[PDB]
């Protein structure tokens, strides 16, 4: 379990919290991130195994992607997301087709690496009010590229299934 806590301390100060769809989150000054085996808000998720990635895609990703904790990557984003019942009712082949064949989530995002490093956390199965916690780190000079990527994905068929989403932006403290 990785716990994201909006509060008065932590490795990240919070630049901004803005609504995207559905209910937003309360303001806080800092974000702490920490492992755990079990305040304005607190959110938890789990880094997990691949649900959609195929081998050729994994190869393509690992060849360009960067890791967390880069000295220059002093800006970050946390985007909590919940998809609709209609999404979760669909079968695996139908979700994969929307995710990649129609939305090209992977193929269209590859150009943004290595600039944008990412980590995905899953939390539907632990009863959290979101389904995913998406975490991104980048240099200040790539922030406009980052907001551009985000706007691109938010225009996709995949995103028509998002029913709650919040925009949190951070600066390394």
134 binds ligand HEM (CB under 6 A): yes
Q: How far apart are CA 33 and CA 51, in angstroms?
A: 24
Write phi, then psi, for 53 (nearest 5 degrees). Answer: -60, 130
Shortest Cβ 34–ligand HEM spacing (Å):
22
CB of 35 to ligand HEM, least distance (A): 21
- Considering beta carbons, is residue 37 or 56 the nearer one to ligand HEM? 56
Strand ranges (E), 73-124 = 75-83, 117-122
The length of the chain is 173
* Residue 170 Cβ vs ligand HEM, minimum distance, rounded to whole Å: 14
Annotated binding residue 53: yes
Q: How many CB atoms sit inside 10 A of residue 28's CB?
A: 20
Among 44, 75, 118, 142, binds ligand HEM (CB under 6 A): 118
Q: Which of 132, 166, 168, 169 binds ligand HEM (CB under 6 A)?
A: 132
Question: Tokens 């975490």 appear where?
Answer: 135
Least Å from the CB of residue 83 to ligand HEM: 6
142 is in an annotated binding site: no
CB 117 within 8 A of CB 68: yes
Please check if 64 is assigned to a binding site: no
For residues 8 and 32, the answer to whether their CB atoms sit within 8 Å is no
Near ligand HEM by CB under 6 A: residue from 4, 12, 41, 112: 112
The least distance separating ligand HEM from the CB of residue 70, rounded to whole angstroms, comes to 14
Q: Which of residues 49-108 bind ligand HEM (CB under 6 A)?
A: 50-53, 61, 79, 81, 105-106
Alpha carbon dihedral 62, 119, 126, 37, in 10-degree steps, equals 100
> Can you tell me the distance from the alpha carbon of 134 to that of 118, in angstroms, rounded to the nearest whole number?
7
Binding residues for ligand HEM, rule: CB under 6 A, are 50-53, 61, 79, 81, 105-106, 109, 112-113, 116, 118, 120, 132, 134, 136, 149-150, 153
């Amino acid at each position: 379990f990785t716990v994201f806590t909006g509060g008065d301390s932590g490795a990240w100060s919070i630049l901004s919290v803005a609504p995207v769809i559905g209910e937003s989150l309360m303001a806080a000054s800092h974000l702490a991130i920490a492992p755990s085996l079990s305040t304005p808000w607190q959110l938890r998720g789990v880094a997990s195994h691949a649900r959609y990635v195929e081998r050729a895609e994994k190869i393509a990703l690992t060849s360009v992607q960067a890791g967390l904790g880069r000295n220059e990557a002093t800006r970050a984003a946390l985007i909590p997301i919940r998809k609709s019942a209609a999404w979760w009712e669909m079968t695996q082949d139908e979700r994969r087709a929307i995710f990649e064949d129609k939305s090209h989530h992977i193929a269209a995002s590859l150009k943004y690496l290595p600039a944008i490093a990412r980590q995905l956390y899953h939390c539907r199965d632990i009863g959290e009010p979101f389904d995913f916690l998406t975490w991104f780190e980048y240099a200040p000079e790539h922030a406009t590229m980052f907001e551009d990527l985000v706007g691109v994905l938010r225009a996709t068929e995949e995103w028509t299934y998002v029913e709650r989403e919040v925009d949190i932006r951070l600066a390394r403290a």
